[PDB]
């Protein structure tokens, strides 16, 4: 469960730095967790569809913490559409998934 999407358009701070740890911490009653993360590039609509569908195929009850660096605000609407008929939670963090 739980997945992370990145791609580091401007800053190259990604990969193994955020791959490990995650929700381990020192929680009293945690559960089986994973920090499976991928990489991407400048957003494309069909590319977004394919990537999210592949993640859903490879995930059981995972959510999403997707982010982006493009300045186009349509990413938020497209991701809301994705969340509509998929029932996989996502949270926006940076860039495109930040124009509320």
């Amino acid at each position: 469960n739980i997945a992370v999407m990145l791609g580091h358009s401007h800053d190259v701070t990604e990969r193994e730095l955020r791959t490990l740890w995650g929700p381990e911490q020192a929680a009293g009653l945690p559960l089986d967790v994973n920090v499976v993360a991928l990489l991407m590039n400048r957003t494309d609509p069909k590319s977004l569809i394919t990537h999210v569908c592949d993640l859903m195929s490879g995930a059981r009850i995972h959510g999403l913490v997707f982010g982006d660096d493009t300045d186009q605000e349509a990413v938020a609407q497209m991701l809301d559409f994705i969340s509509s008929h998929t029932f996989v939670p996502i949270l926006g963090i940076h860039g495109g998934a930040s124009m509320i």
Partner: protein, 102 residues
């Protein structure tokens, strides 16, 4: 120019072809002529979105027309086209989808 549009039925596609023939009779277009394209609706919205992307965008359209299918108010007929064309700035034209959310 390409003004390919998504229609409810094939008869509407033939009507659109007749309309574009009439328009080309009253005017002209000196850029790849003025041929159009047509496509129907699909029950799955994701399939519709990917289809309209790969069809209209690959044809380099200048606009598009979207109509409500005979489906009894699914509330999601024009939205995938709207979002896909909203990633860019290409306008869309609604035929009969009267709703205040739009």
């Amino acid at each position: 120019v390409n003004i390919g549009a998504v229609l409810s039925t094939r008869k509407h596609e033939q009507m659109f072809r007749e309309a574009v023939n009439q328009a080309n009779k009253r005017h002209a277009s000196w850029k790849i002529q003025l041929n159009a394209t047509s496509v129907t609706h699909k029950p799955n919205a994701i399939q519709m979105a990917l289809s309209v992307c790969e069809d209209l965008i690959s044809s380099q359209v200048y606009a598009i027309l979207v109509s409500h299918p005979p489906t009894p108010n699914d509330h999601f007929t024009p939205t995938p086209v709207s979002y896909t064309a909203g990633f860019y700035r290409i306008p869309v034209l609604g035929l009969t989808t009267r709703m205040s959310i739009y």
